[PDB]
Amino acid sequence: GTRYAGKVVVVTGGGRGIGAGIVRAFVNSGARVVICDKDESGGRALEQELPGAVFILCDVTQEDDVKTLVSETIRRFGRLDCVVNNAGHHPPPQRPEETSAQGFRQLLELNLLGTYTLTKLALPYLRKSQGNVINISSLVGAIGQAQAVPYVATKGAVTAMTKALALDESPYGVRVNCISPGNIWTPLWEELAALMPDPRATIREGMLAQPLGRMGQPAEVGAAAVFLASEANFCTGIELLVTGGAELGYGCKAPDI
Amino acid sequence: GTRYAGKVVVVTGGGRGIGAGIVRAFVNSGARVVICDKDESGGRALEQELPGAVFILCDVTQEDDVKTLVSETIRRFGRLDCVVNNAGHHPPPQRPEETSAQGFRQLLELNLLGTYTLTKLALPYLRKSQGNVINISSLVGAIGQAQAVPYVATKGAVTAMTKALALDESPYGVRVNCISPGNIWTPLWEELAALMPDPRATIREGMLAQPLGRMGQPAEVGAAAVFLASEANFCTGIELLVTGGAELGYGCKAPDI
Amino acid sequence: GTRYAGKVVVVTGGGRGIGAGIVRAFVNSGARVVICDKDESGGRALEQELPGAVFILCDVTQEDDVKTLVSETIRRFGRLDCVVNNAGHHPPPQRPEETSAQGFRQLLELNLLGTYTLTKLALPYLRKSQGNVINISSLVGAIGQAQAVPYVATKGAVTAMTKALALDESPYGVRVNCISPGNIWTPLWEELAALMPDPRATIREGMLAQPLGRMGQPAEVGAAAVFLASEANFCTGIELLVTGGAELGYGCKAPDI
Amino acid sequence: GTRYAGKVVVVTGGGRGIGAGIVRAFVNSGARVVICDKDESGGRALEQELPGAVFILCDVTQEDDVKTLVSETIRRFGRLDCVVNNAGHHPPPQRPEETSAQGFRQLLELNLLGTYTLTKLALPYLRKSQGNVINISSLVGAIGQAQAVPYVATKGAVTAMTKALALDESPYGVRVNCISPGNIWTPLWEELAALMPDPRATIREGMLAQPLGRMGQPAEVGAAAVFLASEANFCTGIELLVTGGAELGYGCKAPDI
Ligand SMILES: NC(=O)c1ccc[n+]([C@@H]2O[C@H](COP(=O)([O-])OP(=O)(O)OC[C@H]3O[C@@H](n4cnc5c(N)ncnc54)[C@H](O)[C@@H]3O)[C@@H](O)[C@H]2O)c1
Ligand SMILES: NC(=O)c1ccc[n+]([C@@H]2O[C@H](COP(=O)([O-])OP(=O)(O)OC[C@H]3O[C@@H](n4cnc5c(N)ncnc54)[C@H](O)[C@@H]3O)[C@@H](O)[C@H]2O)c1
Ligand SMILES: NC(=O)c1ccc[n+]([C@@H]2O[C@H](COP(=O)([O-])OP(=O)(O)OC[C@H]3O[C@@H](n4cnc5c(N)ncnc54)[C@H](O)[C@@H]3O)[C@@H](O)[C@H]2O)c1
Ligand SMILES: NC(=O)c1ccc[n+]([C@@H]2O[C@H](COP(=O)([O-])OP(=O)(O)OC[C@H]3O[C@@H](n4cnc5c(N)ncnc54)[C@H](O)[C@@H]3O)[C@@H](O)[C@H]2O)c1
Ligand SMILES: O=C(O)c1cccc(-c2cccc(-c3cccc(O)c3)n2)c1
Ligand SMILES: O=C(O)c1cccc(-c2cccc(-c3cccc(O)c3)n2)c1
Ligand SMILES: O=C(O)c1cccc(-c2cccc(-c3cccc(O)c3)n2)c1
Ligand SMILES: O=C(O)c1cccc(-c2cccc(-c3cccc(O)c3)n2)c1
Ligand SMILES: OC[C@H]1O[C@@H](O)[C@H](O)[C@@H](O)[C@@H]1O
Ligand SMILES: OC[C@H]1O[C@@H](O)[C@H](O)[C@@H](O)[C@@H]1O
Ligand SMILES: OC[C@H]1O[C@@H](O)[C@H](O)[C@@H](O)[C@@H]1O
Ligand SMILES: OC[C@H]1O[C@@H](O)[C@H](O)[C@@H](O)[C@@H]1O
Ligand code: NA
Ligand code: NA
Ligand code: NA
Ligand code: NA
């Protein structure tokens, strides 16, 4: 209740899923939290539920929405300590020949450039507070995924950008880290499974992709985020895996001819 | 002279620098090579110099240029075995607050989406030949660089996209790999150093960034590319480092307070 | 004060340096801690200083010492939740031709096999408590170090062993993770610098090896350990870097000839 | 036939499997090859089959055997350009509680210290020739394997040691690299499968662990070794994956509870 007391945190895509788990974790740590989301439904309810959280409608692909998000955070709370860039999307499975440069550009706008834009607008305030940035990437940026060329590319970009910005902001004492989740049970995971030929089989495969034999929870990503913000003062430019071991060992990915 | 005989290779940005080194390596291996570049000067001279290389003017950011590049390669040579996505650029050093979303989008168009577009248009022919794709990324996609947030992001994207496409194309026997060079002495390296406060000091730092104590050569990247195309039949989705050891050991990157 | 209340932790090499920082972090989290060390001086004083910590003399290279460490922990505290394998040593800088297979074997006994032996003897109790293992490796296991072939080899082994054991123990709900510190200011760091030609220059180089421009503290490694034990329930087989960014970017590691 | 003409190569464990594939690749490149093996059967036959290869009986765990291997190579061929440290073994699958420190020490002697000892004794001659070292590690050193704690640890050590030695030998122009194979169809692979409950199922799982849907061949590891020796003059301290993509994507490794 006191690990991050007195601090102000912005969480993008905080209305449901991982983002909402991160919001809850920071509120439980004593922080005040600004929930940013393009959708009113979940975020507005979260603001009613949690003292110390408020909701600001903001589409991170719209630069003026994001400018207003930062200026309202400062006007209302007087400081900014941490930005969590969680807003993002995974398209349906798409073979490479089924993708388009147009769709790729649109996914870059959300998953990469929205993270860039909020970070840029927040850094003057983060420098004053010696605050930090936490980007939500994905394990598949590191190891790849089938039927997801644009999505994987955007997450490889986020992870790399995290390291570049960590170098640039280190002289100011501003840390920049990312979390790479694996399979986390969220509304997005459920939506994707529901469009599959056999949703139940997809969910079962998703559980068995981890040595731990289950999917992760938003609360687990949230705890990792609170650690990076509040207790990781010698960590910058790291990729914190929250994956249940999915990257470990040999598995089913498809005698020497 | 026979390691890649009978094969047809397209090299983007092949008019100078690393690209020209890759062109020369493939010609020396027995391949026919299509040199793609947006600039006529170097590529046209290379086509006169090298029997078995021809030049096609093509800006990889223009989708119809790239469509014509593929259709002319097939019309003239009857097959396509390997695409080397080398065209790319490094902006001047830029602090994060000095970058723009606009500039970031333009760099994504070249370094990421041009690679995507040629690969997409070539894959139907690569499937017929069980050919392969080689993307030229950078070590800094993996470890970061100072004053280069957009560039680093684009190269993290390329490396990740390589792994995603390797998964997707593996059932067809089409391999997709990347090379991550470190400091290679090229016209781009020289141009960047020339705008620095002390160009000679920048060049010396560039040499000493490798344990080997020198920069790499285009011919060395070219040899790695010929290996991946011609003799690496069980390699897919790898990142081949051609860096002189720059990523190894502790160095000068800036007692416990 | 309650994050790890009711839990029992064993920390090897806990008498000074990183180990003592880890001991303090777990006591502050509410745990009872068994301090293991081959040296009485620091550990005995820590047991007097910290309610909830006790000292057991134990050389982790002696299998019967370690058997007694586990049996006494169970006899005295009734359970075992976490083992932190921190005991280890760095030899003086040694050129490869100055090392011996004999010295290499002795360093393997401490840095690798002592970690193996305590882990093996503790796992039956960790399975009962769904506890976890935390190994202290090093960044140089991942990126190398000059004049340290045996030390680097032992830390590459620890990091890899962590992943293997994470796979094996995942069906039992026992997580196995490691922390890879970079330059942490400890008595061992000070001892090594003191034998150098210019100790002050070595210390300054050590600070500048991180983009953050300082060395890390034992308390920072300790906070990472408490996170892994208490709040990282979907993390297994990870390597948590506590390095200040030392692995990021180009540096001084030693134009193309 | 000329890529490595005039050069002298030592391959340990060269009598069968990957080692024999490496021997053949270097002979085909124009090199003279010394086949080292503890077993006479395969190596002696290879020496009769291949002009330019000779067999020397040598157990790499016996330091005086290795001293004689180097001194006889120099006496017979007058120079030494490349050492390939391939000799190694994989124990049967063993749960952690079924391993012993004794067995772990014995596996370290072969897989780690034999590589160390030959490298040490060869480096004075490699410095004279600006030669290179190639260590055969394993993908599982990087990602782990189930039921193989000692084996995984030894391969993590080899990969890390490669980077340390690359740093140390870089001032002399001696490169040190490793190859990490995945599933390669060899007599050792066949022996391990034969002791499994269902050998045919194990072999099928082994093929499907790669996106390419087959196991690799010794000849493919051999081609990678010839590349590193003969054409990778700016590569030092790299880990060259020859794995068929086994490390890519999600797989079967075992909804959020
Ligand atoms: N669920 C997983 O398994 C998983 C794994 C790895 C990474 N991730 C990443 O975690 C993040 C959250 O994923 P999730 O599964 O919780 O997704 P989700 O779809 O359940 O939640 C995403 C939230 O972000 C909001 N959002 C979307 N576009 C936005 C925009 N333009 N502006 C503002 N808010 C926007 C949505 O409205 C929603 O409330 C994403 O970046 C995703 O790539 C998820
Ligand atoms: N030089 C290095 O140290 C280094 C290091 C790592 C990665 N790289 C990468 O290697 C690649 C080549 O770099 P370089 O140093 O040889 O650069 P360069 O500038 O010397 O050569 C690049 C070539 O690509 C061409 N090109 C640029 N934009 C193009 C476009 N839109 N369409 C077609 N051709 C285009 C240029 O005209 C030029 O001939 C780039 O992807 C770069 O990011 C270089
Ligand atoms: N200090 C750094 O920069 C750094 C960096 C990376 C990793 N590490 C690792 O962190 C760990 C602790 O390092 P440190 O700098 O605190 O060292 P230290 O020498 O200051 O402390 C090590 C402690 O372990 C004890 N110890 C040594 N051998 C032992 C044995 N056989 N049995 C029991 N206890 C034993 C010592 O007596 C001492 O109290 C080591 O594993 C080291 O490799 C340290
Ligand atoms: N086969 C795979 O899938 C695979 C995968 C990754 C790594 N590797 C590694 O590749 C190497 C070769 O493996 P393989 O499958 O060809 O094995 P193998 O058992 O088929 O061949 C190993 C050879 O080394 C020899 N050897 C063993 N101990 C020796 C010693 N003390 N001194 C000298 N020679 C000795 C054996 O007699 C044999 O001829 C090993 O290091 C192994 O760990 C193999
Ligand atoms: O790993 C991630 O970062 C991620 C994020 C959100 C949802 C999912 C998800 C959830 C459910 C199915 C799939 C799926 C299945 C096959 C191909 C493919 O392309 C995607 N993917 C993953
Ligand atoms: O590492 C690469 O992929 C790369 C590619 C081409 C040129 C250079 C280069 C060449 C010369 C200087 C710099 C430089 C220096 C300081 C900051 C910065 O941002 C870039 N960078 C690198
Ligand atoms: O990075 C580590 O895990 C580590 C751990 C403890 C101490 C030191 C240290 C401390 C001081 C000097 C050196 C040093 C300097 C040159 C060569 C060399 O071989 C070691 N090394 C590192
Ligand atoms: O990946 C390697 O470096 C390797 C090397 C040689 C043989 C095999 C192999 C060959 C056949 C089975 C297994 C196996 C199966 C289950 C558990 C286990 O522990 C090992 N392992 C792997
Ligand atoms: O929709 C799947 C899951 O999404 C998570 O974000 C929610 O916290 C869970 O209650 C829900 O079961
Ligand atoms: O301009 C720097 C270097 O660029 C390379 O691409 C050329 O091959 C060299 O001849 C030249 O010195
Ligand atoms: O000896 C160097 C440092 O070692 C650390 O373990 C101690 O906590 C510090 O007080 C000390 O300055
Ligand atoms: O024993 C399995 C395989 O081992 C390889 O080393 C040989 O080259 C193959 O002929 C054989 O089928
Ligand atoms: Na509220
Ligand atoms: Na020509
Ligand atoms: Na006490
Ligand atoms: Na012969």
XYZ file of N, CA and C and ligand atoms in Angstrom, chain A residues 90 93-94 138 140 145-148 151 181-183 188-189 192-193 196 202, chain D residues 250, ligand 5:
82
model
N -3.829 -7.402 -31.377
C -3.382 -8.515 -32.219
C -4.438 -8.794 -33.281
N -5.233 -14.272 -36.930
C -4.207 -14.985 -37.697
C -4.352 -14.686 -39.177
N -3.223 -14.356 -39.814
C -3.176 -13.951 -41.213
C -1.904 -14.507 -41.836
N 5.833 -8.237 -26.300
C 5.348 -9.601 -26.338
C 6.547 -10.509 -26.504
N 6.494 -12.837 -28.501
C 6.634 -13.202 -29.906
C 7.477 -12.205 -30.676
N 6.040 -15.678 -34.147
C 4.746 -16.350 -34.086
C 4.327 -16.652 -35.517
N 3.589 -17.741 -35.704
C 3.011 -18.017 -37.010
C 1.780 -17.147 -37.263
N 1.558 -16.844 -38.547
C 0.389 -16.109 -39.042
C 0.239 -14.754 -38.359
N 1.357 -14.050 -38.192
C 1.321 -12.763 -37.506
C 2.497 -11.854 -37.864
N 2.099 -8.128 -36.567
C 2.105 -8.033 -35.111
C 3.494 -8.285 -34.549
N 4.972 -10.238 -22.163
C 4.127 -11.340 -21.732
C 4.091 -12.413 -22.790
N 3.807 -13.618 -22.331
C 3.369 -14.699 -23.181
C 1.861 -14.739 -23.199
N 1.314 -15.944 -23.159
C -0.125 -16.156 -23.192
C -0.769 -15.716 -21.879
N -8.921 -10.064 -25.246
C -8.350 -10.217 -26.583
C -8.017 -11.676 -26.872
N -7.420 -12.376 -25.911
C -7.154 -13.799 -26.127
C -8.448 -14.536 -26.429
N -9.805 -13.764 -30.016
C -9.070 -14.464 -31.064
C -9.428 -15.940 -31.102
N -9.476 -16.587 -29.938
C -9.842 -18.005 -29.909
C -11.230 -18.241 -30.489
N -11.520 -18.999 -34.181
C -10.775 -20.149 -34.661
C -11.712 -21.294 -35.016
N -7.911 -24.419 -29.366
C -6.956 -23.314 -29.341
C -6.635 -22.905 -27.912
N 5.640 -20.549 -30.497
C 5.061 -21.305 -29.400
C 4.930 -22.775 -29.787
O 1.524 -13.686 -28.064
C 0.922 -12.627 -28.154
O 1.482 -11.481 -27.963
C -0.560 -12.601 -28.295
C -1.299 -11.500 -27.870
C -2.685 -11.548 -27.871
C -3.344 -12.683 -28.331
C -2.626 -13.792 -28.773
C -3.318 -14.974 -29.352
C -4.419 -15.547 -28.732
C -5.048 -16.616 -29.345
C -4.568 -17.100 -30.546
C -3.458 -16.490 -31.117
C -2.906 -16.929 -32.426
C -2.977 -18.265 -32.836
C -2.404 -18.670 -34.030
C -1.766 -17.748 -34.843
C -1.709 -16.417 -34.452
O -1.133 -15.471 -35.247
C -2.275 -16.005 -33.254
N -2.835 -15.439 -30.528
C -1.232 -13.750 -28.709
